[PDB]
Design a protein around this nucleic acid. Structure first.
Length: 1298
RNA sequence: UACCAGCAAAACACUCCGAUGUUUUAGAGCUAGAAAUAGCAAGUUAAAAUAAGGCUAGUCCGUUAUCAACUUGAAAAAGUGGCACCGAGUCGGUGCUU
DNA sequence: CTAATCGCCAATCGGAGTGTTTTGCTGGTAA
DNA sequence: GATTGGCGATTAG
């Protein structure tokens, strides 16, 4: 009978229903409603269009901030509960005036002065402490009684902003000098390693280690003055420890265990104690010193003040910024006043000129201010001392800038500690509540506990030991913390698939290693002169290999098996041819062999391994093994806490040793352990029919959930639901008969670039960025991008290149494009000429490799797999098997998601079960790629262009169907790679390349094609092409747009100043927008058509109205709860309840002459028509834009004047735009001088005026055309409304002109 | 179609923390002139909010995913739209079963 | 009044940890 | 990351 062909995409789905001999049937349908139409005739071909889906990141980024905004507010509430009783005797309303600051004077109840409460005290206070840091510095260094309000202000400011948590441990801000250190350091090296002393080389390491440089540059500068040292040397290792690195101390100390040390993690003490155990304490304070330096050079960019003067080095360094601004301002003012009197009106008085007034009051950043002020400073005389600071970004700085994110939280704690001790003698209540204020600052919830819910949330997993409120002071006596870190990991671990409801084993377990190691050794073969055939391996040999090779090295080399076993035991000179890592570590740690050999002591090691794999913190691990103590000794635990594993395997425990061969002895694990006659692997054991595993394993094992459970981007998983629903709708139409076949085909920046080029320039030391400054919208071109990635140097020649020479240069792929079709950065290079690459059919010549190995290694630059392909010239090159495989992949759909879709369709299509516990096929599912159809179109001249209409979406499904059905029925044995279910390479390559040669005539073939057994008629080259041509030109395709309701944010997020309009929305309930401001950009969900009456004039003339109203996202619930009261509050009277109609977005209307419009909102409209240009002009337009066909293009030239007539005629009755059409005609009238190629390229641009969708702007040869927005939804109130189904064949029409 | 092995490339889902930006109020502008108008002097900081709001009253939740119209249904969804030809103005016609 | 065109605007920058597929040279092995 | 619907000022009825 019939067949179906589909085509899935990210914004469209196409379908078609072919028949016996490649024809599309037509049918009569029924139309409902109250209109005059009672029937219609339609063809079975169409398409569907929809929008794109999004991801869940933008919602998480706000969910994880709503919680912080409310957790920060509770920190201040705790501080006010300790100060209330004492403050209730000084000022009764101090805490009340602090909450009504954001209030106009009329709405205030108390006075308008917050802190003190008079006009003569506020001014005095503001005249003594211009900034908050003056008070902070005064409180620490003074020894007098202070008012309570100032103490509260300082503490609140310190607590609100607290700093970052990146360094673990305790800081110490006393050592600011750097050189006492390089001295102190060397001092010790040669205080025990004397006679052989590293040379101090009078190194003034001051600028070497203190300059604002990177770690690598400081490393190169350190040993520059020392005559010869090693980057990997132990002095270098301890130096790298001083900076931020991860040195290893195994070298030069003949160690066997890795000794990676980090100075910022919270494990340094234990690792240092362990490392000082195998060497001793003779070399001790060579470390207490490396510490001092480590902290002495990271506190060098924020603290720039001296010592032995103050105990507050951060507050004292923010007064230098204040005192170096008031001094430069006067000088600049005087200099501008004297030598340039005509400009002292916009630098200091205009708020929209990026001067000094537009930098303090208006909106402007430091960069814009500097860029604006540089010429003015340059022109006049003097101003030497000010031009230098501008190059250091230290001209006129502010104390709250964007670069304050490098301040640790251990500095704010010291000032608070210092303040709390000077004033603990006058106020006794500060002596008791002193350990709580320090705890409010440093508390932080662990990342494996989550929200503190009470069983009313969806993202929570935490348990509780006692029903009580959780506070920072009792967090350890309420939260269990023991089972909270186990449910964090076990809620994401995979389940088994051969036996569900079972958890998988750890990767590094003991049973799992037994299974993995011995399974591999069950099949191996070796040949010697004495032996006759390649024999297998026995269990004893495997045990010996494990004992001698596995237990001496985790990885067992094949050479070790060849030499240590064969040569020593079997006496074999030559022969031809997994890790028990846990066992050797346990042997080294426990130091008891018979303990591990004993098989009674089980259910113990598995628990130990699970404990080590599961938790991460140290107290957790200790307490878990606390019950597992008293058995070995005290010493083993200290080393057991230091071991950690990672990884989860995929196999259950009961599957291995719970349903094993209890009826035959040898376990599933032991079957692969001590093999016998039946050397059968696990796959043979499961997949055979001789044992009783199958019954037990097979005893165990909605559409939306299944589809949502797949793997892939959300944007593609939207096109499968629609495909399934379209299929189910199409089956019903054709009489509830299932299709014979189904053919499916699934058709498939700048900031990264400037980040990459900036990193490359910074690491390479190149100065070309200063030479050629680049903005944010320049280097999107690949040629200049590649030019800058190489520091402007050729890579095939070793010469410097030019910024405007790449134009005449070339871009070439590393691997030739004839083998790999790659167009990414990893495959493209820029060169003066491709001939310098060497061979044109292989990897570049070895001369280039030898001459550029150094620069390829330098490109450590992270700018560029590319190195491997470039260096392949020395590795012998490529093969042909990969070419054959890729040729097969070019037409065989090997992607997994297509297999998922095919399985989903096949499972629901076939349901009848065979009586022999099997299934019978009724519908075939075929998958194929797009190469075949493209080749067919190119060969048989069915050209297509994509910028006329959307009909081309539905013209590919028909071609897929015809090609697939024709091909599958001619070769009855190629179903292996084309149907779902279940030397030579060159022959397969040729066969798959020439598959599609049965359509053509000469490479002469008969007109009639027959197939084997019956001479089946599969093609007839006298009428089939005529049918295809007739179908490809039909002015009837069902295009349908999907209607959706809108959701998302309420409006725009920008806050606007006060105004006197009625379009502003209040931010809170009691804040009038005419005195505080608000947002104004509401988003409409859907519209409603109401017919009612409203009063007019003072006489209340009850006129009758019928209009459209918009319902925003913000007020949906109020409307959906009671529409009548909502409408009455809006201002309408006597609302007719039975005539309210909802209208979602993208609704369809019908005007007088077939003119249709969509609905984008309650104020605008869209276009809803299509163009049907004949099939001759498509071929002419495709040929003109690019042998004998040139002559044909030349003879037929008047076609350029027939397209314009059709465009004008179509636009004069549907589009209804006059000025744009007149401009287009006038522009076309005077440009008939250029040849056909460019005129065709510009005629193709004219199809933007008649394109379905929103209006847009296009451009002709020179002229630019603007938009033609429609802004009146008043005419549509007397038209017809159309409701359509998913395919569009079923529809109803309602007349709104009643 | 599954299990071990080296690395690399990624993509997706959840939890815990930093620094800015924007909007109102406080930091007493002065000298001449009835008046617009001129002349001069300062400018760097702090408090509150950050989707309107909810009931289950928690140091909890609020921007992803699903959605043609009528008849019945709490809900999901069971029931609901007759076949072939020619011409080829968007469909029309004829001949009958219907 | 009063309704229709024209020109400009739209929140952004860093860090730490855990779990899972899918592709590309490696394979092997096996049903 | 551009698109595509909102709002103020001007201008034509």
């Amino acid at each position: 009978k019939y067949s179906i062909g589909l085509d899935i995409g990210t914004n469209s789905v196409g379908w078609a229903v072919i028949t016996d001999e490649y024809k599309v049937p037509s049918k009569k349908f029924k139309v409902l409603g109250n209109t005059d139409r009672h029937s219609i005739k339609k063809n079975l071909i169409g398409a569907l269009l929809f929008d794109s889906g999004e991801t869940a990141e933008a919602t998480r980024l706000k969910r994880t901030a709503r919680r912080r905004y409310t957790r920060r507010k509770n920190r201040i509430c705790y501080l006010q509960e300790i100060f209330s009783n004492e403050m209730a005797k000084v000022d009764d309303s101090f805490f009340h005036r602090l909450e009504e600051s954001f209030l106009v004077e009329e709405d205030k109840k108390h006075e308008r002065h917050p802190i003190f409460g008079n006009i003569v005290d506020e001014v005095a206070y503001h005249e003594k402490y211009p900034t908050i840091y003056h008070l902070r510095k005064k409180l620490v260094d003074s020894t007098d009684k202070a008012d309570l309000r100032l103490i509260y202000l300082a503490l609140a400011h310190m607590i609100k902003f607290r700093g970052h948590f990146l360094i673990e441990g305790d800081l110490n801000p006393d050592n600011s000098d750097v050189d006492k250190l390089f001295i102190q350091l060397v001092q010790t090296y040669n205080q025990l390693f004397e006679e052989n002393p590293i040379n101090a080389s009078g190194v003034d390491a001051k600028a070497i280690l203190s300059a604002r440089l990177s770690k690598s540059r400081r490393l190169e500068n350190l040993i520059a003055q020392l005559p010869g040292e090693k980057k990997n040397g132990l002095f270098g290792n301890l130096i790298a420890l001083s900076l931020g690195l991860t040195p290893n101390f195994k070298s030069n100390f003949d160690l066997a265990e890795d000794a990676k040390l980090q100075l910022s993690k919270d494990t340094y003490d234990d690792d240092l104690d362990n490392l000082l155990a195998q060497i001793g304490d003779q070399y001790a304070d060579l470390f207490l010193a490396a510490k001092n330096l480590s902290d002495a050079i990271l506190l060098s960019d924020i603290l720039r003040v001296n010592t032995e003067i103050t105990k507050a080095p951060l507050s004292a360094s923010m007064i230098k910024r204040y005192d170096e601004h008031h001094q430069d301002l006067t000088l600049l003012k005087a200099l501008v006043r004297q030598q340039l009197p005509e400009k002292y009106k916009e630098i200091f008085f205009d708020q929209s000129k990026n001067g000094y007034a537009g930098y303090i009051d208006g909106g402007a950043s430091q960069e814009e201010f500097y860029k604006f002020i540089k010429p003015i400073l340059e022109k006049m005389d003097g101003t030497e001392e000010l031009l230098v600071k501008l190059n250091r970004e230290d001209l006129l700085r502010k104390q709250r800038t964007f670069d304050n994110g490098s301040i640790p939280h251990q500095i704010h704690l010291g000032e608070l500690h210092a303040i709390l001790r000077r004033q603990e003698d006058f106020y006794p209540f500060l002596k008791d509540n002193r350990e709580k204020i320090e705890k409010i600052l440093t508390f932080r919830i662990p990342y494996y506990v989550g929200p503190l819910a009470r069983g009313n949330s969806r993202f929570a997993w935490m348990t509780r030991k006692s029903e009580e409120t959780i506070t920072p002071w009792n967090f350890e006596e309420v939260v269990d913390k023991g089972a909270s870190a186990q449910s964090f990991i076990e809620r994401m671990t995979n389940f088994d698939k051969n036996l569900p409801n079972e958890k998988v084993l750890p990767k590094h377990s003991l049973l799992y290693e037994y299974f993995t190691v011995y399974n591999e050794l069950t099949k191996v073969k070796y040949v010697t002169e004495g032996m006759r055939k390649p024999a297998f391996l026995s269990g004893e040999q495997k045990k010996a290999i494990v004992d001698l090779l596995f237990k001496t090295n985790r990885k067992v080399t094949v050479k070790q098996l060849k030499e240590d076993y064969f040569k020593k035991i079997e006496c074999f000179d030559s022969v031809e041819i997994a890790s028990l890592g846990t066992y050797h570590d346990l042997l080294k740690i426990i130091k008891d062999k018979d303990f591990l050999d004993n098989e009674e002591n089980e259910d113990i090691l598995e628990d130990i391994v699970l404990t080590l794999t599961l938790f991460e913190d140290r107290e957790m691990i200790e307490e878990r093994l606390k019950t597992y103590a008293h058995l070995f000794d005290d010493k083993v635990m200290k080393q057991l806490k230091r071991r950690r594993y990672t990884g989860w395997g995929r196999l259950s425990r009961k599957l291995i040793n719970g349903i094993r061969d209890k009826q035959s002895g040898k376990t599933i694990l032991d079957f692969l352990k001590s093999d016998g006659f039946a050397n059968r692997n696990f796959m043979q054991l499961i997949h055979d029919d001789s044992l009783t595993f199958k019954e037990d394993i097979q005893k165990a094992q909605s559409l939306h959930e299944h589809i949502a459970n797949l793997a892939g981007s959300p944007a593609i998983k939207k096109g499968i639901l629609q495909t399934v629903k379209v299929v189910d709708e199409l089956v019903k139409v054709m009489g509830r008969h299932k299709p014979e076949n189904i053919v499916i085909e699934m058709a498939r920046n700048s900031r990264e670039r400037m980040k990459r080029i900036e990193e490359g320039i910074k690491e390479l030391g190149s100065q070309i960025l200063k030479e050629h400054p680049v903005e944010n919208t320049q280097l999107q071109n690949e040629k200049l991008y590649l030019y800058y990635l190489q520091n402007g140097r050729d890579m095939y020649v070793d010469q410097e290149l030019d910024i405007n020479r790449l134009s005449d240069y070339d871009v070439d792929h590393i691997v030739p494009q004839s083998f790999l079709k790659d167009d990414s950065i990893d495959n493209k290079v820029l060169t003066r000429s491709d001939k310098n690459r060497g061979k044109s059919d292989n990897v570049p010549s070895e001369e280039v490799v030898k001459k550029m190995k150094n620069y390829w290694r330098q490109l450590n630059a992270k700018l560029i797999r590319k190195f491997d392909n470039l260096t392949k010239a020395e590795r012998g090159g490529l093969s042909e098997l990969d070419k054959a495989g890729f040729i097969k992949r070019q037409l065989v759909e090997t992607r997994q998601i297509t297999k998922h879709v095919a399985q989903i369709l096949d499972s629901r299509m076939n349901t009848k079960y065979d009586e022999n516990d099997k299934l019978i096929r009724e519908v075939k599912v075929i998958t194929l790629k797009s190469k075949l159809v493209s080749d067919f179109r190119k060969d048989f001249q069915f050209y297509k262009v994509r910028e006329i209409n959307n009909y081309h979406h539905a013209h590919d499904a028909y071609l897929n169907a015809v090609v697939g059905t024709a091909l599958i029925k001619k070769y009855p044995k190629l179903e292996s790679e084309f149907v779902y279910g279940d030397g030579k390479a060159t022959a397969k390559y040729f066969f798959y390349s020439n598959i599609m040669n049965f359509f053509k005539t000469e490479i002469k073939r008969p007109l009639i094609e027959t197939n084997g057994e019956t001479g089946e008629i599969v093609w007839d080259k006298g009428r089939d092409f005529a049918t295809v041509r007739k179908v490809l030109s039909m002015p009837q395709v069902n295009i349908v747009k999907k209607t959706e309701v809108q959701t998302g944010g309420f409006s725009k997020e920008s806050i606007l100043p006060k105004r006197n309009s009625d379009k502003l929305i209040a931010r809170k309930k009691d804040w009038d927008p005419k005195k505080y401001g608000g947002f104004d950009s509401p988003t409409v969900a859907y519209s409603v058509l109401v017919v009612a009456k409203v009063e007019k004039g003072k006489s209340k003339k009850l006129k009758s109205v019928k209009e459209l109203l918009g319902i925003t996202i913000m007020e949906r619930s109020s409307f959906e709860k009671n529409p009548i009261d909502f409408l009455e509050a809006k201002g309408y009277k006597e609302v007719k309840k039975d005539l309210i109609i909802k209208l979602p977005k993208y609704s369809l209307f019908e005007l007088e002459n077939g003119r249709k419009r969509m609905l984008a909102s309650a104020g605008e409209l869209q276009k809803g028509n299509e163009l049907a240009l004949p099939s001759k002009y498509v071929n002419f337009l495709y040929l003109a834009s690019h042998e004998q066909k040139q002559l044909f293009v030349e003879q037929h030239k008047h076609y350029l004047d027939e397209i314009i007539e059709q465009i004008s005629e179509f636009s004069k009755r549907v589009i209804l735009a006059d000025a744009n059409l007149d401009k287009v005609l006038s522009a076309y009238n005077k440009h008939r001088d250029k040849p056909i190629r460019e005129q065709a390229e510009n005629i193709i641009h004219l199809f933007t005026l008649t394109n379905l969708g929103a209006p847009a702007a296009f451009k002709y040869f020179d002229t630019t055309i603007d938009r033609k927005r429609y802004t009146s939804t008043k005419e549509v109130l007397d038209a017809t409304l159309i409701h359509q189904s998913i395919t569009g064949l079923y529809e109803t029409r309602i007349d709104l002109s009643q």
